[PDB]
Design a protein around this motif. Structure first.
Motif, short mmCIF file in Angstrom:
data_model
loop_
_atom_site.label_atom_id
_atom_site.label_comp_id
_atom_site.label_asym_id
_atom_site.label_seq_id
_atom_site.Cartn_x
_atom_site.Cartn_y
_atom_site.Cartn_z
N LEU A 92 0.95 -1.11 0.15
CA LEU A 92 0.05 0.13 0.03
C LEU A 92 0.91 1.39 -0.04
N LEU A 93 0.63 2.06 -1.15
CA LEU A 93 1.36 3.51 -0.69
C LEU A 93 1.18 4.08 0.50
N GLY A 94 0.02 4.06 1.15
CA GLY A 94 -0.28 4.54 2.53
C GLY A 94 0.49 4.04 3.52
N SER A 95 1.25 2.69 3.54
CA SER A 95 1.87 2.22 4.48
C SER A 95 3.27 3.29 4.77
N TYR A 96 3.62 4.17 3.70
CA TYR A 96 4.45 5.01 3.95
C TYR A 96 4.12 6.32 4.56
N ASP A 97 2.78 6.49 4.83
CA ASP A 97 2.23 7.93 5.40
C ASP A 97 2.75 8.05 6.93
N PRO A 98 3.43 9.27 6.97
CA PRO A 98 3.73 9.48 8.41
C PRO A 98 2.63 9.64 9.17
N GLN A 99 1.38 10.32 8.50
CA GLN A 99 0.06 10.28 9.31
C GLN A 99 -0.84 9.16 9.57
N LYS A 100 -0.06 7.78 8.97
CA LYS A 100 -0.65 6.56 9.33
C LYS A 100 -2.00 6.42 8.78
N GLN A 101 -2.23 7.06 7.66
CA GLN A 101 -3.67 6.76 6.88
C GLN A 101 -3.18 5.79 5.81
N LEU A 102 -3.71 4.60 6.18
CA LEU A 102 -3.13 3.50 5.36
C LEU A 102 -3.82 3.51 4.02
N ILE A 103 -4.91 3.98 3.79
CA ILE A 103 -5.89 3.69 2.75
C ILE A 103 -5.82 5.08 1.71
N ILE A 104 -6.05 4.81 0.74
CA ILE A 104 -6.03 6.30 -0.16
C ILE A 104 -7.28 5.91 -1.14
#
Length: 153
Positions: free
Chosen positions: A111-123
């Motif tokens: 998941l691209l979102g797994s790299y989110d500093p804010q931890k929103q896993l899903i786009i």
């Protein structure tokens, strides 16, 4: 070199945005020659189409544009890219299914979102939304792409 393939269901909203943003980021850092960057779709519904006008306008609001036209992911993509970064759970399950069907799966599917500093896993798919939904997606893409780039370096 390093290769990344962005994937969403239709390859007209989310993955063309992530791709344009990632390309912009490595171009600004002058490392674009060390990257092969693309996007594609799980489905073949939109093949040959440029991105949604709302995605194009969203990008244009941030001084960014793309010459991309939609294509379906193929078996070779799994053999070719180092990273396949997708947007939501159903993309991830579809890609994990397709990967089991290919002889050589080099790609790390994440998941691209797994790299989110804010931890929103899903786009989430902004297709049935408005311009604000495209802006939310853009912000998620930007911050994930920044973290992905910074994690590697």
């Amino acid at each position: 070199s390093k290769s990344v393939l962005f994937v969403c269901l239709g390859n007209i909203c989310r993955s063309p945005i992530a791709e344009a943003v990632f390309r912009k980021l490595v171009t600004d850092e002058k490392v674009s020659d060390n990257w092969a960057i693309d996007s594609s779709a799980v489905s073949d519904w939109n093949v040959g189409r440029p991105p949604d006008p709302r995605a194009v306008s969203c990008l244009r609001n941030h001084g960014i544009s793309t010459a991309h036209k939609a294509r379906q992911i193929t078996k070779e993509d799994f053999a070719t890219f180092d990273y396949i970064l997708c947007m939501d759970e159903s993309n991830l399950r579809d890609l994990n299914r397709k990967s089991n069907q290919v002889k050589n799966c080099k790609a790390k599917i994440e998941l691209l979102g797994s790299y989110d500093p804010q931890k929103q896993l899903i786009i989430e798919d902004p297709y049935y939304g408005n311009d604000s939904d495209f802006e939310v997606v853009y912000q998620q893409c930007l911050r994930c792409c920044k973290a992905f780039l910074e994690k590697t370096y």
